[PDB]
Design brief:
Bound molecules: potassium ion, magnesium ion
GO molecular function, one term (chain G): structural constituent of ribosome
Largest interface: C-D, 25 and 33 residues
Shape of chain C: elongated
Oligomer: part of a larger assembly
Strand content of chain C: 5-15%
Family (chain G): Belongs to the mitochondrion-specific ribosomal protein mL41 family.
Order of helices and strands of chain B: HHH
Shape of chain B: elongated
Distance between the termini of chain C: 29 Å
Largest sheet of chain B: none
Structural class of chain C: little secondary structure
Number of strands of chain C: 1
Radius of gyration of chain C: 16 Å
Structural class of chain B: mainly alpha
Distance between the termini of chain B: 34 Å
Protein name (chain G): Large ribosomal subunit protein mL41
Keywords (chain G): Mitochondrion, Ribonucleoprotein, Ribosomal protein, Transit peptide
Number of helices of chain C: 0
Subcellular location (chain G): Mitochondrion
Chains: A mainly alpha (47), B mainly alpha (108), C little secondary structure (37), D alpha+beta (353), E mainly alpha (46), F mainly alpha (76), G little secondary structure (95)
Number of strands of chain B: 0
Helix content of chain C: under 10%
Strand content of chain B: under 5%
RNA sequence: AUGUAUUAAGGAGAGUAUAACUUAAUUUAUGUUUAUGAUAGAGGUUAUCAACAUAUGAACUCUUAGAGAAAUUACUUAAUAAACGAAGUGAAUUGAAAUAUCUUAUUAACUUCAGGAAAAGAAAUCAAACGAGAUUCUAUGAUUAGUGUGAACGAAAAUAGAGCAGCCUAUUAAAAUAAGUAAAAUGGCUUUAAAGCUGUUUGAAUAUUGUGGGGAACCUUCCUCAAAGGCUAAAUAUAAUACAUGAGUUACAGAGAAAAGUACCGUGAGGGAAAGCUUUGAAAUAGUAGUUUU
């Protein structure tokens, strides 16, 4: 049972990261400090 | 309330097929299974939801009200008082109960 | 204003049995005669 | 889409309605099996109460011929020896209803806010061993029974032969357990008049200053005596000894942080997401733009199919509709203050004079 | 009297006559299913 | 595939169902593998075999008596 | 036949062309002469990483008490896409 | 059983911590109040010793792509029971102490179509010389008018209650005010002969400056309404859920089902059980004992 609770937790954190990253991309498209076009330097610290 | 109800042979669940043949089995000839003579058959004259209320003339109902009010008057059991008929509970208790210092267990 | 009804006072902390150092004290072996509160 | 949510909401209700019908049927089967298992403890007690009604009439009648019932064979109904209980009835391990656990604990909080702990002396107030005083050793929170390791609460019990050697004596004396309702708390208080400490019996306890810790799922409260407000400290309870096993991960590794968020590549291979959730489940709420775009065009293809007969209209049918649109833009005329003042005169003249 | 009318019976003819697909796929078989379904039957066919 | 006996939902009550069958696979290893032999009954004390045996015989004798009652008979 | 006839039919009961699978997946296609061609694009493989040197085990010592995360004041604490994007900038700006 | 409120697609197969439900089968977070609550400890399996409110991960197969011997194949972000409603078709048992008209009966049933309700609906309506003012539901009116040889069948006006809402610029997008129509003959339906529905053959008029319909054969005057174009919530029907009440039941009762459409029976459609708890222990029946007779 304890081995099955670690296997369940792994599937909860991976499902959480996929959805969190799938939204950050959208939220990062409307950000003025991120340029998704160029991958070499896609972020510039705001002044 | 008069809401009691019972199922007759025309309301009991099941099929209305004939149980045993009219003749040939030797047993008493039987019809449907919902007959009162069967185990789970319906009660013929069972209770049903109806109205038990009756009628009483307004004048006869008013005479009965003043007769019960006079039966108490002649026996001295009719004690009329002035307006504001409330229990004169102590003021201290009312001040504490309203304030909320006293718990329910003590207030009651 | 003072009232004529005594209400339960503020809570107090009862000393734990191990901390009691009173010489004139002995645990009760039988429950008969002990006050119930 | 708003139509895709109704699909999910409807599915979530169909499954929850089926889980209740199954759970209900199981609650009734499990209850019917316990009641029949507890009934064997009720039957043994009923059979021993009547056996005592006949054993006392014989000691009265026979006199010097009184039998030696201790040397008799067991009772084949329950399999117990003379003057001995059964493990189920001596340990009080039979499950009780939920309205019983609340009644047994009614005097000390509630089944989930119990105000008595192991290590605190109590006084028995029921049974043969009334007014006895002992210290709680165990505290069974399932049946709300308490074990007091006193030599007076011992009682013969018949040991089942499936857990007993062949030279072992069939009957042994074990410590009998009592329900929580049959014991009250004994705590020494100070005499406010003289300052002398004496023992008293606490008839009721209630929790106070309850505070929960959501991150740890813990709580800490205080127990006090209602009516007198005497906060009684908790008894000295030793925490369980937690140890590090060889199969457990070291503390240095469990604390290592290796996750670095990414934005241009997924946190894991995109194929893994198909294993975490079912792509085709009717409970999927996170759809792709290409899908929602295809779902919204099903209605757009119906409003264009409902209004597809607008190309077969006759000139008079088109003229009428065209006029209707123009008219609905005019609106409704309004009554100016001058017009309202003239209407008020008519009303007052025809009502008052 | 009753006869041994099920001697030599095969379970392939049982699925072709009183099977689930013989009923969902016919107008008269959809009624039998709904009736047994409305009554509470677990065994809608075969 | 190993099939499973058909049974009733609740042992002796309920509709007749059939559990999910079992699948066994036998692989032809390229390197031989030999299992160890079971420990002797007297050397299984780590598993509490003594107590386990007494409990097993008890259930064995209660299952046998419940089969004698299923034949419509009793032990004289 | 009285009762067994009413159970659900299985492949271990009848043989006259009755086939029923166990949902093992299609690994290829059928040929016209009764053979089978395995399409290895449908065959599935299991990606097991090298476990030499891996120190994490499936258990954590009971000394370290279980604690959750607070995320105070953020309703969508663990799922907030803002705390995932802002956290990304400081730690990993390039990727 | 009734009432109130809310809701408007249902079932099965297999698996799983056997209070916990979907291969993640006891997910993860927020806010508030915590004994003056709500209605200064121990305890992560020796667990869930916390309720309320709001979010949240996961949620398999079939019914339900195509094929097929439902829960398989093969593919894929393929997916909606019953009752209730409208129309079409439309019996027989039964009564008439037989029986044809009639009644049973605009019934049961089937068929199609549709929605959470549907249908109907703002007068070509009723009234009677005064006037009322859409539809739906309930009672009275009414074992009435009336019809029919009979047996029986059976309105409306009006009144009271539940709801109330009007419009075409319809609060969702519709009329340039309705012609093979109104109506007539004939064959049927409904029915009192009118009005209404209808197959066949025929076939009008254009507003109170009196054109058209109706007012129970029919004609006329008057009154009244304005067909051949439309929209419209509520009160009503059914099912599920929850709750309230009881001179309702308390285990052969209540329901068919206190574990049920299950076991069981049937090729099938279909038929369809028994079984509560620890209390009390009646009669019949059986084996003996005491007194007594044989
Ligand atoms: K006659
Ligand atoms: K008449
Ligand atoms: K006519
Ligand atoms: K019954
Ligand atoms: K008896
Ligand atoms: Mg019949
Ligand atoms: Mg009955
Ligand atoms: Mg009376
Ligand atoms: Mg603590
Ligand atoms: Mg999964
Ligand atoms: Mg989801
Ligand atoms: Mg024959
Ligand atoms: Mg043959
Ligand atoms: Mg075989
Ligand atoms: Mg065979
Ligand atoms: Mg074949
Ligand atoms: Mg199909
Ligand atoms: Mg399919
Ligand atoms: Mg009427
Ligand atoms: Mg007109
Ligand atoms: Mg006409
Ligand atoms: Mg006329
Ligand atoms: Mg006409
Ligand atoms: Mg009009
Ligand atoms: Mg009664
Ligand atoms: Mg009875």
């Amino acid at each position: 049972r304890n081995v099955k609770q670690t296997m369940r937790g792994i599937k909860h954190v991976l499902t959480e990261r996929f959805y969190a990253w799938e939204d950050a991309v959208k939220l990062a498209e409307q950000d003025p400090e991120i340029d998704l076009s160029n991958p070499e330097n896609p972020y510039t610290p705001s002044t | 309330r008069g809401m009691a109800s019972t199922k007759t042979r025309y309301e009991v669940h099941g099929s209305h097929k004939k149980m045993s043949p009219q003749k040939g089995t030797g047993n008493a000839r039987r019809g449907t299974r919902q007959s009162p003579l069967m185990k789970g058959g319906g009660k013929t004259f069972g209770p049903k939801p109806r109205d038990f209320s009756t009628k009483l003339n307004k004048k006869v109902y008013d005479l009965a009200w003043r007769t019960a009010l006079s039966y108490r008057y002649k026996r001295g059991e009719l004690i009329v008082t002035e307006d504001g008929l409330d229990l004169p509970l102590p003021n201290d208790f009312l001040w504490l109960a309203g304030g909320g210092k006293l718990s329910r267990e003590l207030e009651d | 204003r003072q009232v004529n009804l005594v209400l339960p006072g503020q809570p107090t902390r009862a000393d734990a049995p191990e901390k009691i150092r009173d010489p004139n004290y002995e645990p009760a072996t039988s429950g008969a005669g002990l006050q119930e509160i | 889409m708003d139509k895709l949510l109704r699909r999910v909401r409807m599915a979530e209700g169909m499954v929850a309605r089926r889980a209740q019908r199954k759970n209900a049927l199981l609650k009734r089967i499990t209850e019917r099996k316990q009641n029949k298992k507890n009934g064997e403890a009720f039957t043994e007690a009923i059979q021993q109460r009547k056996a005592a009604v006949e054993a006392r009439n014989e000691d009265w009648m026979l006199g010097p011929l009184a039998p030696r019932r201790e040397l008799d064979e067991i009772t084949l109904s329950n399999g117990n020896f003379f003057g001995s209980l059964s493990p189920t009835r001596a340990l009080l391990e039979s499950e009780v209803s939920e309205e019983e656990r609340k009644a047994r604990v009614a005097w000390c909080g509630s089944p989930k806010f119990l105000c008595i702990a192991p290590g605190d002396r109590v006084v028995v107030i029921e049974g043969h061993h009334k007014d006895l005083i002992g210290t709680i050793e165990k505290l069974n929170t399932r049946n709300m029974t308490v074990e007091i390791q006193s030599e007076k609460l011992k009682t013969n019990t018949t040991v089942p032969q499936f857990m007993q050697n062949d030279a072992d004596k069939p009957v042994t004396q074990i410590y009998a357990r009592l329900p929580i309702s049959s014991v009250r708390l004994v705590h020494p208080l100070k005499d406010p008049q003289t300052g002398e400490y004496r023992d008293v019996i606490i008839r009721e306890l209630r929790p106070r200053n309850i505070v929960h810790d959501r991150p740890t799922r813990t709580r800490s409260m205080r127990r006090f005596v209602p009516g007198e407000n005497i906060i009684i400290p908790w008894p000295k309870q030793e925490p369980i000894k937690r140890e590090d096993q060889p199969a457990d991960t070291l503390r240095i590794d469990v604390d290592e942080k290796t996750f670095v968020p990414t934005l241009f590549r997924p946190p894991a291979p995109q194929q893994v997401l198909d294993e975490l959730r079912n792509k085709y489940s009717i409970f999927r709420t996170r759809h792709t733009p290409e899908y929602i775009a295809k779902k919204e065009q099903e209605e757009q293809e119906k409003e264009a199919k409902k209004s597809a007969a607008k190309a077969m209209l006759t000139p008079v049918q088109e003229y009428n509709r065209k006029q209707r649109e123009l008219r609905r833009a005019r609106g409704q005329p309004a009554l100016t203050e001058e017009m309202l003042a003239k209407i008020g005169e008519v009303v007052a003249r025809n009502k008052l004079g | 009297g009753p006869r041994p009318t099920m001697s030599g019976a095969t379970r392939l003819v049982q699925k072709r006559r009183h099977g689930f697909l013989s009923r969902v796929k016919t107008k008269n078989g959809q009624k039998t299913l709904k009736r047994r379904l409305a009554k509470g039957r677990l065994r809608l066919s075969a | 595939v190993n099939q499973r006996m058909h049974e009733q939902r609740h042992g002796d009550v309920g509709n007749w169902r059939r559990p999910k069958s079992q699948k066994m696979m036998i692989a032809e290893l390229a390197k031989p593998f030999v299992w160890p032999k079971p420990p002797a009954e007297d050397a299984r004390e780590a598993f509490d075999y003594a107590m386990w045996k007494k409990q097993k015989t008890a259930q064995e004798q209660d299952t046998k008596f419940q089969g004698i009652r299923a034949q419509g008979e009793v032990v004289p | 036949g009285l009762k067994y006839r009413k159970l659900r039919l299985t492949t271990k009961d009848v043989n006259k062309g009755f086939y029923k699978g166990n949902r093992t997946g299609s690994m290829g296609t059928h040929t016209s002469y009764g053979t089978y061609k395995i399409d290895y694009t449908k065959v599935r493989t299991y990606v097991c990483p090298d476990l030499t040197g891996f120190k994490l085990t499936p258990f954590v010592s009971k000394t370290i008490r279980p604690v959750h995360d607070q995320f105070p004041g953020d309703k969508l604490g663990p799922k907030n896409p803002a705390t995932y994007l802002a956290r990304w900038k400081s730690e990993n700006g390039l990727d």
